[PDB]
Ligand binder design. Structure first.
Ligand SMILES: [Mg+2]
Ligand SMILES: [Mg+2]
Ligand SMILES: [Mg+2]
Ligand SMILES: [Mg+2]
Ligand SMILES: [Mg+2]
Ligand SMILES: [Mg+2]
Ligand SMILES: [Mg+2]
Ligand SMILES: [Mg+2]
Ligand SMILES: [Mg+2]
Ligand SMILES: [Mg+2]
Ligand SMILES: [Mg+2]
Ligand SMILES: [Mg+2]
Ligand SMILES: [Mg+2]
Ligand SMILES: [Mg+2]
Ligand SMILES: [Mg+2]
Ligand SMILES: [Mg+2]
Ligand SMILES: [Mg+2]
Ligand SMILES: [Mg+2]
Ligand SMILES: [Mg+2]
Ligand SMILES: [Mg+2]
Ligand SMILES: [Mg+2]
Ligand SMILES: [Mg+2]
Ligand SMILES: [Mg+2]
Ligand SMILES: [Mg+2]
Ligand SMILES: [Mg+2]
Ligand SMILES: [Mg+2]
Ligand SMILES: [Mg+2]
Ligand SMILES: [Mg+2]
Ligand SMILES: [Mg+2]
Ligand SMILES: [Mg+2]
Ligand SMILES: [Mg+2]
Ligand SMILES: [Mg+2]
Ligand SMILES: [Mg+2]
Lengths: 186, 53, 125, 66, 147
RNA sequence: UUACCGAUACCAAGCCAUAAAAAGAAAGAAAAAAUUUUUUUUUAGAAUCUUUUUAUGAGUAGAAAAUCGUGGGGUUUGUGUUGAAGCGAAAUACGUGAGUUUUCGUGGAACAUCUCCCUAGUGCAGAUCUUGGUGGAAGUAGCAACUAUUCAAAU
RNA sequence: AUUUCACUCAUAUUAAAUAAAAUAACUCCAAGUGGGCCAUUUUUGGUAAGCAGAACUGGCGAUGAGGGAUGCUCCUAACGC
RNA sequence: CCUAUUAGCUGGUUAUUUUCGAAAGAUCUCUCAGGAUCGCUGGAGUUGAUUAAUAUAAUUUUACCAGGUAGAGAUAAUGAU
RNA sequence: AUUUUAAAAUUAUUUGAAUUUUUCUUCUUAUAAUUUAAGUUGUUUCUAUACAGUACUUUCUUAACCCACUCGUCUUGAAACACGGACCAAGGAGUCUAGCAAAUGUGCAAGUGUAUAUGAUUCUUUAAACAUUUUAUACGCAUAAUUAAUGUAAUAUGUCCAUUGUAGAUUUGUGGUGCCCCACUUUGCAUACAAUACCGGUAAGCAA
RNA sequence: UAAAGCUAAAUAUAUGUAGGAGACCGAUAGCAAACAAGUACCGUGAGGGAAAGAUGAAAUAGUACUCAGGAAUGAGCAAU
């Protein structure tokens, strides 16, 4: 015998392969695995990892937030591993160069009308092999509604979690345990 | 009940099996209805079967 | 008991019979894993039936070879045995059970022309 | 009818299964109920500092473009 | 599909995954929402705090059509126009648009966001909030009440 | 005080599997037998893939992955009066295993699909389990109330 | 108190030693369990008990192999071929 | 016939190999053969480390802190003698 | 098919210096070979000048030597003087529907889902498939919260700008050791910890 | 605009009768009943209620003749 933990074997804690079956995505995975291996650049490793993640870890990015992130980076390229969407709250748009996995129709029209362009990842592999003058960006990953129920249970003192309820009103879970007048508040 | 779920609400406490209705013929019926209102037109012989509202 | 002829080594030759299959005839000899408290075969008492395990596995380099030292491919008609003209020194053919005598004669006389061996070229004769 | 009623056999074996965890050692804590009349003044101080900093930033943005 | 169900994995085992000592008996704690306030109290308290008791006034015959009122913020107010029509109002300084939000299904104009500086606009609606009305007056516009 | 004998534990080497690692997506001739002529064998490049290195392997209740088999459906491409399915006995056969494959005999009319998918009334040693058939006990227990039968003939 | 600016505190042997220390930290969804017993040492009730009740460790349960003739708990030692 | 009424209780619960691996404590309960809830376990997924470092440790060393058990006392207090 | 190379060792000729003064004395200071390097090679015989023999492979049967209590179940504890099981064949037990959530795959995205119907040169199959009424208000969920409630409703017009700080992925410019890691410089995603402003309710102060 | 009245269509159909079809069952299955099945049989009565399909293409080929035996039945140099 011998006194090891998890005997002599090393633990890893994440996703290892694609689950999706889109042939084009499989070709992309092959390409960026090759690029990551043969030029250890830390730019292609991260991209090779990000396009393996599940849907909830590839959130969309709005046009306005993308323009805000690129304000001090003229004539550079923004790289997103998600979709980018339109934003009616903006009045005007600048000229931008953006590579993303998907664009919506309105966002694609607005970008090209200002003189910009939209890129796929196989073109970025051909023009910026090691990511020179490229900026990696992510969207908000904890803005989903499901994350509002996680954390401390609703009922523990000073929590912020939403409850699961049929509907909302004065008759739906507002009496005992949420006000001092019925025996205690939270 | 034991987990973080919503509290249950289902109204299944009477003899609910006697009156259940699966709809197998919602397109057969519309074919039948179309043929009847088309048969009416050939008997009106030129006048329409609608009325002004 | 280890058996070895050339480079092929077999780590055991006897079957793993099911526990209690020699005493009750409603119990068939095909191996089933014993579950249930107080077994004496699940608990590895000495003197009873052994259990199979991955340790008896065969060498990857000699895992499916026959004593002929070739792999076996089973054919049903003439057109299926044409991919063997490129790899005739590593494969041998065997004719399926449900083909008629007339079909068998042709399969055999083509295998002879291709210089591939036939495992059961004596049946229905 | 009678049974056991207390022991803590096995308890710290389970406790040390996933180690003894420590607090997370953050940098800032919340001054919610803490000493009043001293942190309101601190708010005033930081407002003055921020006003000065942003006035300088605006000024520089004004000259640099001429 | 019955092909991928978890029960097929336990087909040779005795207890079907429910344990030797504590079996799978039928309703060992009650039916439905039975034991709450007695022996299900902790689950109720930590997952649904304010469940017991009543509060408020009764409304005997509601008629929800009387208080239907969808809203729109001043953020989304220039976005209702097409981009080409949004464009010419920037160059020309003599003309402003007049927008009727009740033709789009909105009833009350609400005041979150920012309007473009010195870009006048005229808005029609049934209700306005104070902040929204001030923000419309600031860039040189006017609010009009309809019915 | 010495020698010796003795574990599934310790040491060295082979093999199976699990975990981790070093690498690979810009391809060219090697022997032997034959008297500078012929003949054999090979001449690889599937990404959950291919080579190579190290450490490790107990398990009830419980959880997960990969794999084996059954009735029926879509696609593909097959067997059969020169004998299908099924059944009996087997095998210089393959697999750690569930199993797969084949020979002989019987049989007399249909049977597959592993190319990839869909679907379910889909896998038994037990429940004083259900229905049907069959044993040892065994040529054994037993064939005991009601007084009682005999001689000769016919058929 | 905070905000700036200037100067300066060992590091290649790491502000004492040792470390198959990142086999780490965190979030989510769920199973089984909630009758225990035993040994050395401390210890309460009882004349005592293979009795009843506690403490710290290690076991048996959930576990086979060599030894104690024999033996759920003792000694050596934990398990691919 | 309603009716396949209800059962916190007895009995049963169907192929293979490989990997990880428990609890029989605790709080509330018309609760004591039950249950919810925390603890112990599996799976999924991010963030990190891959730089013989730092985070880290059922271990020591150096500096400092808190204690009234084994012992002792009866001429020091209390209570025995 | 180009780390069974390099190096190292050995042997025989050499180019020079030591010292231990020598047929294994040292220092690859020049070429050739060899292995002790760079995980087993060779010679004879037999099977045999065979075609299934009494030999070789394989499956059954029967001995020996060592070892081996009856399975399933409840239980701290089962070979038990604990319960079920005389034998064999067929049958035999976590499924269906509603409603919610988490995880994952797919489509579109501030929107999304063509309800009931209607249309068509749809009509064995077809009870399928196809279509949508010739500055465009059916309905659900989402896009805004909070209060018993009358109700009220998210920086603010100085600038289409997008609140503040600490750590932090990626990018920009110099130098260090080997595209990587460091020391400065530039930018500052996700997220963690805090600060600030504003909206609904309640206190406090003032109040036509 | 109460204390009198009538009235098609769009809706339903575990019954009766006819027609068509299915990723349904295949003689311990499917209706209790694939057959002289609500039949045989049980109960004073209200009621209860089964088991049981297959020679061969053709019997318009269902076994002629002989021997043994009281007969059943067996055997053949004999027969579909
Ligand atoms: Mg080991
Ligand atoms: Mg074998
Ligand atoms: Mg046991
Ligand atoms: Mg198990
Ligand atoms: Mg059970
Ligand atoms: Mg000795
Ligand atoms: Mg194991
Ligand atoms: Mg079926
Ligand atoms: Mg078959
Ligand atoms: Mg079944
Ligand atoms: Mg069966
Ligand atoms: Mg059986
Ligand atoms: Mg009998
Ligand atoms: Mg007798
Ligand atoms: Mg219990
Ligand atoms: Mg042990
Ligand atoms: Mg003894
Ligand atoms: Mg019942
Ligand atoms: Mg383990
Ligand atoms: Mg019990
Ligand atoms: Mg137990
Ligand atoms: Mg007992
Ligand atoms: Mg037992
Ligand atoms: Mg006894
Ligand atoms: Mg019992
Ligand atoms: Mg019995
Ligand atoms: Mg989802
Ligand atoms: Mg609703
Ligand atoms: Mg106000
Ligand atoms: Mg006044
Ligand atoms: Mg009337
Ligand atoms: Mg039919
Ligand atoms: Mg029947």
């Amino acid at each position: 015998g011998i006194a090891l933990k998890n005997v002599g074997r090393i633990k890893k804690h994440g996703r290892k392969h694609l689950v999706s079956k889109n042939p084009y995505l499989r070709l992309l995975v092959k390409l960026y695995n090759f690029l990551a291996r043969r030029t250890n650049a830390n730019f292609n490793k991260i991209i090779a990892k990000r396009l393996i993640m599940p849907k909830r870890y590839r959130p969309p990015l709005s046009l306005s937030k993308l323009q805000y992130h690129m304000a001090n980076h003229p004539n550079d390229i923004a790289v997103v591993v998600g979709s980018i969407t339109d934003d009616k709250r903006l009045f005007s748009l600048k000229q931008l160069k953006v590579c993303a996995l998907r664009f919506t129709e309105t966002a694609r029209k607005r970008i090209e009308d200002a003189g910009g362009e939209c890129l796929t990842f196989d073109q970025l592999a051909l023009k910026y092999p090691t990511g020179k003058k490229c900026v990696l960006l992510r969207g908000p990953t904890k803005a989903r509604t499901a994350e509002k129920h996680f954390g401390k249970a609703p009922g523990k003192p000073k929590s912020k979690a939403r409850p699961y309820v049929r509907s909302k009103g004065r008759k739906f879970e507002k009496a005992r345990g949420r006000r001092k007048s019925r025996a205690y508040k939270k | 009940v034991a987990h973080n779920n919503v509290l249950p609400n289902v109204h299944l406490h009477k003899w609910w099996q006697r009156h259940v209705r699966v709809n197998f013929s919602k397109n057969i019926k519309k074919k039948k209805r179309r043929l009847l209102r088309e048969k009416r037109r050939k008997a009106n012989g030129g006048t329409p079967i609608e009325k002004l509202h | 008991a280890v058996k070895k002829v050339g480079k092929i080594i077999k780590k055991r030759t006897k079957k793993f019979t099911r526990f209690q299959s020699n005493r009750f005839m409603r119990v068939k000899p095909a191996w089933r894993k014993p579950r249930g408290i107080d077994c004496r075969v699940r608990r590895r008492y000495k003197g009873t039936n052994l259990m199979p395990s991955i340790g008896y596995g065969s060498n990857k380099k000699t895992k499916f070879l026959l004593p002929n030292n070739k792999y076996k491919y089973v054919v049903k008609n003439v057109k299926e045995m044409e991919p063997l003209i490129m790899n005739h020194t590593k494969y041998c053919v065997q004719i399926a059970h449900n083909v008629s005598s007339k079909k068998r004669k042709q399969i055999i006389e083509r295998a002879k022309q291709m210089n591939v061996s036939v495992i059961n070229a004596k049946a229905r004769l | 009818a009678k049974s056991k009623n207390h022991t803590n056999h096995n308890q710290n074996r389970k406790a040390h299964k996933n180690g003894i965890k420590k607090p997370k050692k953050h940098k800032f804590m919340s001054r919610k109920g803490l000493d009043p009349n001293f942190f309101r003044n601190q708010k005033y101080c930081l407002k003055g500092i921020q006003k000065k900093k942003k006035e300088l930033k605006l000024k520089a943005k004004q000259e640099k473009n001429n | 599909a019955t092909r991928f169900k978890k029960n097929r994995k336990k087909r040779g085992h005795v207890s079907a995954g429910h344990g030797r000592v504590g079996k799978h008996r039928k309703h060992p704690g009650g039916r439905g929402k039975a034991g709450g306030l007695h022996h299900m109290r902790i689950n109720f308290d930590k997952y649904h705090p304010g469940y017991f008791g009543k509060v408020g006034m009764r409304h005997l015959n509601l008629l929800k059509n009387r208080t239907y009122c969808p809203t729109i913020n001043v953020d989304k107010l220039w976005g209702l126009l097409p981009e080409e029509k949004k464009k010419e109002f920037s160059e020309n300084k003599d003309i402003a648009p007049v927008i009727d939000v009740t033709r789009k299904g909105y009833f009350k104009v609400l005041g979150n966001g920012k309007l473009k500086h010195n870009q006048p606009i005229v808005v029609k609606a049934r209700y306005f909030s104070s902040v929204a009305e001030k923000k419309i007056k600031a860039v040189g516009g006017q609010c009009i009440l309809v019915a």
